[PDB]
Write a protein that binds this DNA or RNA. Structure first.
Lengths: 86, 103, 125, 207, 64, 201
RNA sequence: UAAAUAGUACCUGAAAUCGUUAAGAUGGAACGGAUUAAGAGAGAAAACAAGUAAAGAGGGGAAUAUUCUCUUCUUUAUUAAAAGAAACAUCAGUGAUUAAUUUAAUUUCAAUAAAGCAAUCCCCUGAAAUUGUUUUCACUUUCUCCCCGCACUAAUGUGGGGAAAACUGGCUUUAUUUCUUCAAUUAUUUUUUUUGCUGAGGAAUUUUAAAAUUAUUUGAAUUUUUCUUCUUAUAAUUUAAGUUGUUUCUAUACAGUACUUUCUUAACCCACUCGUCUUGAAAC
RNA sequence: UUGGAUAAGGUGCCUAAAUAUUCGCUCAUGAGAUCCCAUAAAAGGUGUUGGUUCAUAUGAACUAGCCCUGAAAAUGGAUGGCGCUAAAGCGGAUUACCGAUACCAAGCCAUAAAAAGAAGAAAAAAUUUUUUUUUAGAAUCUUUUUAUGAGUAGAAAAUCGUGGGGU
RNA sequence: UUUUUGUUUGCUAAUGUAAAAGAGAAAUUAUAUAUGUACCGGUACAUAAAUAAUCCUAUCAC
């Protein structure tokens, strides 16, 4: 067959849907999910964020222990150097 | 007084160029009051007229114009590249062009 | 530089000249491939007498046709227009250089009444 | 009529197909296989009452009032001839810088905005298209210069399709004359010509 | 093409066949350029060659 | 760059930076006139720059010094030669650019009565640290054999007095015009007055 | 003499070389490549007008030396059409630019106003008592106060020595996030401003089929709807199924000041003497 | 060939692109300035900039960056030149940009390979009737598709010409 | 020296632009500060310190 213009399979909607039969449904779902009104998220932001307090607690704890380990190694090396000095 | 301007003034620098090699498909143009890439991007679709005089008459007139169009910015200091219907002659380097407000 | 007239694209004008034919009278401008050993042009040095190559070839859909979008056919007789009766729209006619005035007039008359265009219509008159 | 792939609503208007090409093997055919083409989609800043600046014509630099979007992309404009000398002219959008001032943002002109719209609703592109017969008559006399120019003017005046535009011009100008004239600074603004001084930088100034 | 994308992204059972069926990608030069093709991506100085790990994505995006 | 001509007061500029800017302007086609070239500064001590010029002077075609590098002692000619060295003067366009430049010592008759511009990118005050040595081109030229420095100085002091008189007259005229403007601002219509006040006129 | 620029060196009469005239160039080579520009020569075979009516000159063919018909030139007036090019717009392909955006992940933050806690004290951080665990002091602002120098400062303050609470800074509660903040990176998605270049092809049995969109219609699903999805049928359209349209101009010309082209000059960039032997030649 | 974007390398001028941003070092009365590359050493410095280890913010000893001495050649002379010191030098860092006959998209030529092939009406312009084009079928051929293209010595194919012969 | 028309046998009418579109802009100087004024370089007082990021000039025909 005669070669024609290679349509952009990403931006040309007809050929994109031809190549991916599920793309029209996927894009429609994404668009309607984007269409959600701001009031729901405005009223639910604090409800969503407050449930992450335990994660924040363990999340601080892990980094605190990591820095404690770093400081303990630093102190041990300093003490070893002091011992080597004499 | 009379003879309204309604165009911005520019100067024809050389061609699109490297050291010891030329690409006379694009002409470097310096526009009057623009000195940055951001400001040069403002004049991108604009038409350019190289209006020059001539020793004798050609259509009853002593003046003729080479038409071109801004294509993209050049460098960081507001120089642009322009593509003309015919390559402008290197005798025109340093001459004046009109960056018109249309389109 | 290319020149484009309608569907016709002439990929290059100003026919290639033989290397060093500009400064030697015994070297004619007709193109000859420089065989040489260190010949500049053969090695494709910058800025000297580029060599012809197949890349310059014309689009074969519009290759041999004249600026009138017709192929030229050279005739020396009135009897050599019968093929053109069926090709009057894509062939133009050119009269051979060594055809006398009488035969030229006859050929022009036949071409006109065959509505076939003539390239050198006003020769020898 | 329209299509809205990816939510666009591009709007389709019928398009003719006149270019004719020869077919591959036997016949000839019309090259264009399409019947509709998407519409012009003019600039956002283009409204009826706006005042714009002409950039290309013999009226370059003059200020005019938008009149009507002419269903073909071009827009009718009237720099009211009684105040400015700019006639009822069909101009292209991109040859026209539109300012931010509306003629109908004035209190004494928002009243007659409706009459302005009623007068302007009846102009069309055919009225601006030059007729073949009058074009032929104008070109006939080309085969002294003052007489030629005057006869060209006379033929243009006697063109029956110019006269309706002249009448619309006259009535719109009569409608808009006193209200415009009673805004003295704005009247001078309209009668003035926009020039590019060497202190204004057109990538900084606002239209 | 979605099946091909799946088989390529997850090294599925039909991976050799899909990869061989696919012509070698002919990429553009990077939009913002390279750093130094001479030097490694892992060298402290700017460099390009070697395993970029997840950083190949931005380079592909500029090259595609 | 977009003027008929640019007059540059070369006082207090660094020679190389000034020459580079001038050369680019000339190549782009802008005619410039460099005045007070004797007050150009060069980084580095006066002795160091004098050593450089002696190196330049020792340079000549020993077969025939007439064909040799002409050395030129006037500071204006020194600036001209530096600009030429920053320029493709052996081509037609480069030669046109070179001829578009005019250099003077002091301020002659037409150029003392027109605006003088300054290139901040080449000012010594902005380009040299205060603790680093610099030299004066006129002094270097006098050490090299120019011997017109003092005459330029006295011409400059005379021009200074004339310019001071002109400036006093201009200041008086400006004050009178300002008072006239304030007295006339009350006679125009209030709407125009508010427009002017709003836009700072 | 047909012819003497066929005059005895006599057919034709090339190149090298030289003369005349004209035009142009000309700062220690000249020429050249590539791209244009200015001039000067030429040119209409695509670079508009097919046809129609009349009269003038002709040529043919058919019809049984007399009728119809076909046409070629010239003039008159009498109409189109098409072709190219520009501008704008549309679409598609390929870029450039500036505004964003859904949903998640990653110790984020930062505020508003009402309480409270700690005072070298707090979120932190620092120094000391087979791994964890625990303890001590030492960490802050002042446009505060006291003493000494008591004006000594860089200072519209200052150096040293002591106190103070808690504005500041930190923490603990409740309500809010449009007063203010809601960042950044990544993953996953959806758009958007202004714009450059390009338009191959032309589908008599795949430019079809489908894919998308529009308007009806059937049933279902569902993220629950003015772009929700999946089909049942119909009719269309293009986002399918590689550029189409409008308006001008050329131009109402028959060759010019326009258009095409050759040549001559410039100008920007580039360009070393060819052949040969040679590892290697512009080669002193 | 038309656009785009880059490599190497550059962005003070010559020279297209930064007198860009950000942090240090260096003053040279022969500073220094891109692999190959167009020389520099032993030994020194109370120049300045950081570090290290010892002695009640002092005295030492080291260490290594830049600078300086060591460092002399013949025509006049070369970081390529100008010149540059709030670098246009040296060591980084952050961006943007410029920059190929390389890369990407598209067109066209040829080469190679491939898919395939031994008959019917299309359009436009005038006014149902005319007009204008075409209405194809050559097998070393026709249509379409993809990839590719340096080249001495050397080889081959297809073409282009000359004297003479048959047709 | 001023106005109108034009430069559309080698000659005897005759045109060229490296750059018009508002091509607008005269104080001097110091850069770890300057400049004006008034008294005797000093004293005092003002001014200036994104300076062109400014100011000035344009359209109101008859």
């Amino acid at each position: 067959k005669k070669r024609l213009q290679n349509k952009n399979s990403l931006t040309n909607f007809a050929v994109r849907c031809r190549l991916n039969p599920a793309y029209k449904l996927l894009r429609s779902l994404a668009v309607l999910r984007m269409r959600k009104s701001i009031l729901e998220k405005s009223k639910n932001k604090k409800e969503k964020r407050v449930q992450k307090q335990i994660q924040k607690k363990e999340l601080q704890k892990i980094n605190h222990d990591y820095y404690k380990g770093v400081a303990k190694a630093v102190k041990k090396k300093k003490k070893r150097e002091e011992k080597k000095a004499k | 007084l009379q003879a309204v301007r309604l165009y911005e003034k520019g100067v024809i620098l050389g061609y699109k160029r490297s050291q010891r090699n030329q690409d006379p498909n694009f002409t470097l143009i310096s526009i009057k009051n623009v000195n940055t890439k951001k400001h040069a991007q403002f004049y991108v679709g604009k038409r350019v007229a190289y209006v020059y005089r001539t020793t004798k008459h050609h259509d009853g007139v002593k003046i003729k114009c080479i038409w071109g169009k801004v294509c993209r910015t050049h460098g960081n200091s507001g120089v642009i590249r322009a593509k003309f219907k015919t390559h402008i002659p290197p005798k025109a380097f340093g001459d004046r062009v009109r960056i018109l407000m249309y389109p | 530089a290319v020149k484009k007239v309608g569907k016709i694209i002439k990929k290059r004008t100003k026919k290639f000249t033989r290397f060093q034919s500009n400064r030697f009278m015994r070297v004619k401008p007709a193109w000859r491939k420089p065989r040489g050993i260190d010949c500049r042009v053969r090695r494709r040095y910058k800025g000297t007498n580029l060599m012809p190559s197949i890349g310059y070839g014309s689009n074969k859909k519009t290759k041999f046709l004249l600026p009138n979008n017709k192929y030229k056919y050279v005739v020396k007789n009135v009897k050599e227009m019968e093929p053109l009766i069926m090709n009057h729209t894509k062939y133009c006619v050119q009269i051979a250089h060594n055809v006398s005035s009488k035969k030229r007039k006859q050929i022009i008359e036949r071409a006109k009444q065959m509505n076939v265009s003539v390239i050198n219509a006003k020769a020898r008159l | 009529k329209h299509y809205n792939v990816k939510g666009k609503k591009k709007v389709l208007v019928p398009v003719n197909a006149k270019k004719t090409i020869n077919k591959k093997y036997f016949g000839r055919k019309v090259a264009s296989k399409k019947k509709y083409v998407v519409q012009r989609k003019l600039r956002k800043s283009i409204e009826v009452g706006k005042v714009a600046i002409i950039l290309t014509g013999k009226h370059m630099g003059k200020r005019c009032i938008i009149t009507k979007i002419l269903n073909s992309g071009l827009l009718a404009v009237v720099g009211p001839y009684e105040i400015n000398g700019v006639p009822l002219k069909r101009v292209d959008s991109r040859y026209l810088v539109v300012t931010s001032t509306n003629i109908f943002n004035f209190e004494n002109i928002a009243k007659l905005k409706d009459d302005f719209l009623n007068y302007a609703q009846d102009i069309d592109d055919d009225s601006f298209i030059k007729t073949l017969e009058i074009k032929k008559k104008q070109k006939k006399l080309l085969k002294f210069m003052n007489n030629v120019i005057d006869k060209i003017k006379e033929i243009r005046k006697e063109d029956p399709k110019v006269q309706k535009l002249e009448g619309i011009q006259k009535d719109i100008g009569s409608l808009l004359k006193p209200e415009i004239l009673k805004n003295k600074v704005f009247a001078h603004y309209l009668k003035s010509k926009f020039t590019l001084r060497n202190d204004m930088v057109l990538h900084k100034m606002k239209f | 093409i979605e099946d091909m994308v799946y088989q390529l992204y997850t090294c599925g059972p039909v991976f050799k066949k899909v990869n061989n069926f696919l012509w070698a990608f002919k990429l553009k030069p990077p939009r913002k350029g390279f750093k130094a093709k001479r030097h490694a991506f892992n060298e402290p100085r700017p460099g390009d060659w070697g395993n970029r790990e997840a950083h190949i994505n931005e380079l592909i995006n500029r090259m595609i | 760059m977009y003027k008929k001509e640019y007059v540059i007061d070369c006082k207090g500029h660094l020679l190389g930076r000034l020459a580079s800017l001038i050369a680019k302007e000339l190549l782009n086609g802008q005619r410039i006139v460099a005045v007070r070239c004797e007050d150009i500064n060069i980084s580095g001590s006066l002795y160091r720059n004098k050593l450089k010029y002696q190196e330049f002077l020792r340079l000549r075609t020993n077969t025939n010094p007439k064909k040799g590098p002409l050395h030129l002692r006037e500071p204006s000619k020194i600036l001209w030669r530096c600009v030429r060295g920053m320029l493709p003067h052996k081509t037609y366009k480069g030669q046109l650019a070179l001829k578009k430049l005019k250099v003077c010592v002091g301020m002659p008759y037409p150029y003392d009565k027109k605006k003088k511009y300054v290139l901040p990118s080449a000012l010594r005050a902005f380009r040299l640290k205060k603790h680093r040595r610099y030299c004066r081109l006129g002094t270097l030229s006098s050490r090299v054999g120019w011997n017109y420095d003092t005459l330029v100085k006295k011409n400059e002091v005379l021009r200074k007095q004339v310019s001071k008189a002109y400036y006093k007259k201009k200041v008086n005229n400006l004050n009178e015009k300002k008072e006239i403007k304030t007295e006339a601002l009350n006679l125009i219509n209030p709407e125009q007055r508010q427009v002017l006040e709003n836009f700072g006129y």
